[PDB]
């Protein structure tokens, strides 16, 4: 959403489970599945967080750090920028082509 | 004829006291690409080669039921081991060779089996370890056992840090016998090769 | 993919872009008619009760999903645990009619009564929100599925049949304090 | 027959070798799907209970046979004697959900409730033994068929449908002291 | 149109200020299998993906001739780096992306070149660095330079511990200019991907 005179270069990475904590730098995260992009004429960039797990399905809810309910992290970095101190990157999420939800439940407190 | 040469990558193993190869539970490998890896898995042939481990020393004192095990994968100081640290998920089968060199004047018999999902066996359950893929090593007949097994488990891919599907097991069926002309003990060694190695989920560097 | 975000045209990028492969999806569960097709409770009951799907709990499976639409249509099934006989009258009937056997009346039979009722409103569809009045906030009085009456109504269950939803609206999960995840006890074998 | 025993290749010699004649065999009873297809008890119950086939007795017909396999798959049927209504939730559901009618809930009807449930785990098959952890011995929490909840659960029976077993494991008879036979009272007419 | 997406493995890089790609000295790779490896070489695709390095901070004080270099390969904390330690010989080309983000109100110009067999350049030789595969990064026109080069040298395969054939070089041609509306400095970063990675001569484990 920055002004014409503000530029930036970002990176997004998918860190699978297996590491204790997420990479704090683009250098360390580069070894993961990632994408980098420039700010220009086109304001939007879309990236797919892949489903990579041992089991064929994952739980939607979470309980405690377990293999079926936490599938890693997504890390968003700024490689650098030029005159973009007060400019922002709006992030939204949607379902992918093969996203699927499985078993109907009524878990809300009523 | 009893002469067998096995090749895995740039490593070979020839045995002239071969009883043949035993395939466990299958002769092939299920799809190594399923929905759980979303097409991001890849094969690493550089890891499909032999590595070695000493299992134990078969001595006359060890009686029937004496059991030695090696859960796989074990600590691997090579390419395969690096894979375990660089990728969140992996899958592979095993090509296993177990040798027990003494001489033809020794007696006794060892059972070599590959066991899926190991759990300690009770003394009575040991009379049934032949339900698992196996062969025997008996000095009068052979110095080598050879078993080949596929990847398996509830998950199409695994996290070996957390789960070890296969476990190599060697058990004394009849104690080692010795005479003036025989060897005194027999050191048992494993020659293992991971097969159809696939990894998925590249991990960040630790620094 | 890179696109002009402002236009708001839908963009569905894929795993293929970085060498992955899309995986076959079955979405029967998320199907609107299917997911709405199940019995749900109504809490505030009285011996004389007007059937209003907005009486469903706001965070219930059906209650929340229904709210996440502006307009809807459907037939209905109800399960009523009542004392005495149960009488139902259609949308628009005088409350006084619930007193007469000439209207669909079900004679008590344990443990309860299960009925199939038709949509009876005078509108082509109904709404979960209505910006305005119906009189010369609440929804217009005509947004109902009739009324039921018995000596005592202990339980009411409603089931939406042939549901159609239009114009989706916000649907929320519970808010999260932790800043990492919302954690809760997922079922797991004892011992 | 004489063979090289060490190879471990199967050898099935016959009566013919010394002049006998093999006799026709019917093995329907030993068929896996058939033999697993029957109701068996679960002993440790609580008003909130997670369905875990490993809860079956270790020496029971089904319990022992199930244990004599490493991996398995099957659908299920359950019979529950309960007080109050019974609610079931699928594998992976928050324990909190058992409190809501929106999930399959069966209203009490004497003498008990018999239901058909689908396999709901996220794994292609389940295991009776698992060498490792599922958390960042016992089996992983995901090895279950959902959970059930009622005010009081007096009895639970489980029945394995379409059972498939893989990778057989040891199966034991009772141990024998006598050194000749294990003797016990076989049924015989009175008087 | 000036929009370019580059893909290497499971990593991508999109730039909307692209001046095109410059191929140096070739558009292909010589035989990656010759007599010196006796057919034992193999390809490792898991190493063909992007890694990052910060080159330097382009500031107004830096004058013409100011030169920054990065000899390749550099210390790599990933799969490619492990290869260097596990194999006696390797060979690969480079897919190089260099970015210098400021804004259109900055002035100045950088030269990005790939140099074979680096040796320190004298002040006068710097007027001829355009003899090497290159592109320029000038704020009024672009924020990205992109060069692709093949493997080369007197040997068909190399020992990177001992020799670094390619060297990335960034040189100031005209100093960074700034105004009220521009950025103050410009941090230059490299996005590199080894290409056609082949190894030969597996080494023993260190333990």
mmCIF file of C-alpha atoms in Angstrom, chain A residues 33-34 37 41-51 57 59 61-66 69-70 94-110, chain C residues 1-6 8-9 11-15 18 21-27 29-30 34-35 38 40 43 57 59-61 172-174 181-186:
data_model
loop_
_atom_site.group_PDB
_atom_site.id
_atom_site.type_symbol
_atom_site.label_atom_id
_atom_site.label_comp_id
_atom_site.label_asym_id
_atom_site.label_seq_id
_atom_site.Cartn_x
_atom_site.Cartn_y
_atom_site.Cartn_z
ATOM 1 C CA UNK A 33 10.599 -23.506 0.200
ATOM 2 C CA UNK A 34 10.396 -19.731 -0.381
ATOM 3 C CA UNK A 37 9.350 -10.375 -4.768
ATOM 4 C CA UNK A 41 3.272 -1.869 -10.946
ATOM 5 C CA UNK A 42 1.434 -4.881 -9.516
ATOM 6 C CA UNK A 43 0.613 -4.481 -5.841
ATOM 7 C CA UNK A 44 -0.421 -8.049 -5.016
ATOM 8 C CA UNK A 45 1.597 -11.274 -4.716
ATOM 9 C CA UNK A 46 0.045 -14.658 -3.927
ATOM 10 C CA UNK A 47 1.875 -17.656 -2.465
ATOM 11 C CA UNK A 48 0.697 -21.199 -1.744
ATOM 12 C CA UNK A 49 1.509 -22.711 1.667
ATOM 13 C CA UNK A 50 1.937 -26.401 0.711
ATOM 14 C CA UNK A 51 0.383 -29.304 2.566
ATOM 15 C CA UNK A 57 -4.947 -35.220 6.929
ATOM 16 C CA UNK A 59 -6.403 -31.627 12.595
ATOM 17 C CA UNK A 61 -7.799 -27.661 16.086
ATOM 18 C CA UNK A 62 -4.659 -27.575 18.193
ATOM 19 C CA UNK A 63 -3.873 -29.066 21.591
ATOM 20 C CA UNK A 64 -0.152 -29.059 22.461
ATOM 21 C CA UNK A 65 2.882 -29.384 20.189
ATOM 22 C CA UNK A 66 2.001 -32.630 18.332
ATOM 23 C CA UNK A 69 -1.984 -30.347 14.887
ATOM 24 C CA UNK A 70 1.074 -28.095 14.106
ATOM 25 C CA UNK A 94 -7.918 -17.899 1.105
ATOM 26 C CA UNK A 95 -8.350 -21.627 0.299
ATOM 27 C CA UNK A 96 -6.313 -23.308 -2.459
ATOM 28 C CA UNK A 97 -7.519 -25.433 -5.398
ATOM 29 C CA UNK A 98 -7.256 -28.673 -3.403
ATOM 30 C CA UNK A 99 -8.024 -27.358 0.059
ATOM 31 C CA UNK A 100 -10.454 -29.705 1.807
ATOM 32 C CA UNK A 101 -12.318 -29.868 5.154
ATOM 33 C CA UNK A 102 -13.429 -33.284 6.330
ATOM 34 C CA UNK A 103 -15.552 -34.095 9.381
ATOM 35 C CA UNK A 104 -18.468 -31.951 10.649
ATOM 36 C CA UNK A 105 -18.389 -31.050 14.343
ATOM 37 C CA UNK A 106 -20.188 -28.771 16.797
ATOM 38 C CA UNK A 107 -17.457 -27.777 19.214
ATOM 39 C CA UNK A 108 -18.401 -24.242 20.272
ATOM 40 C CA UNK A 109 -19.495 -23.696 23.860
ATOM 41 C CA UNK A 110 -23.273 -23.343 23.893
ATOM 42 C CA UNK C 1 1.418 -15.046 -9.067
ATOM 43 C CA UNK C 2 1.588 -11.261 -9.323
ATOM 44 C CA UNK C 3 -1.643 -9.353 -9.920
ATOM 45 C CA UNK C 4 -3.220 -5.967 -9.485
ATOM 46 C CA UNK C 5 -4.673 -6.390 -6.011
ATOM 47 C CA UNK C 6 -7.019 -3.368 -6.119
ATOM 48 C CA UNK C 8 -10.237 -7.562 -6.279
ATOM 49 C CA UNK C 9 -10.467 -10.203 -8.964
ATOM 50 C CA UNK C 11 -6.509 -15.131 -7.567
ATOM 51 C CA UNK C 12 -5.923 -18.793 -6.775
ATOM 52 C CA UNK C 13 -2.226 -19.603 -7.109
ATOM 53 C CA UNK C 14 -0.998 -23.225 -6.954
ATOM 54 C CA UNK C 15 1.825 -25.380 -5.561
ATOM 55 C CA UNK C 18 7.390 -23.822 -7.329
ATOM 56 C CA UNK C 21 1.542 -30.826 -7.616
ATOM 57 C CA UNK C 22 -2.124 -30.105 -6.807
ATOM 58 C CA UNK C 23 -4.006 -32.905 -4.998
ATOM 59 C CA UNK C 24 -7.534 -34.182 -5.607
ATOM 60 C CA UNK C 25 -10.184 -32.689 -3.356
ATOM 61 C CA UNK C 26 -13.501 -34.043 -2.131
ATOM 62 C CA UNK C 27 -15.782 -31.355 -0.739
ATOM 63 C CA UNK C 29 -18.874 -32.038 3.735
ATOM 64 C CA UNK C 30 -18.755 -28.335 2.986
ATOM 65 C CA UNK C 34 -25.639 -31.357 3.371
ATOM 66 C CA UNK C 35 -24.080 -29.393 6.204
ATOM 67 C CA UNK C 38 -29.108 -32.016 10.756
ATOM 68 C CA UNK C 40 -30.092 -28.579 16.245
ATOM 69 C CA UNK C 43 -33.232 -22.977 23.840
ATOM 70 C CA UNK C 57 -27.413 -20.563 18.888
ATOM 71 C CA UNK C 59 -22.054 -20.237 17.605
ATOM 72 C CA UNK C 60 -23.747 -23.533 16.887
ATOM 73 C CA UNK C 61 -22.875 -25.419 13.719
ATOM 74 C CA UNK C 172 -15.926 -16.110 13.238
ATOM 75 C CA UNK C 173 -13.740 -18.529 15.178
ATOM 76 C CA UNK C 174 -13.091 -17.914 18.883
ATOM 77 C CA UNK C 181 -2.465 -20.608 18.638
ATOM 78 C CA UNK C 182 -5.777 -21.496 20.224
ATOM 79 C CA UNK C 183 -5.068 -24.686 22.159
ATOM 80 C CA UNK C 184 -7.642 -27.077 23.628
ATOM 81 C CA UNK C 185 -8.042 -30.714 24.654
ATOM 82 C CA UNK C 186 -8.413 -32.864 21.524
#
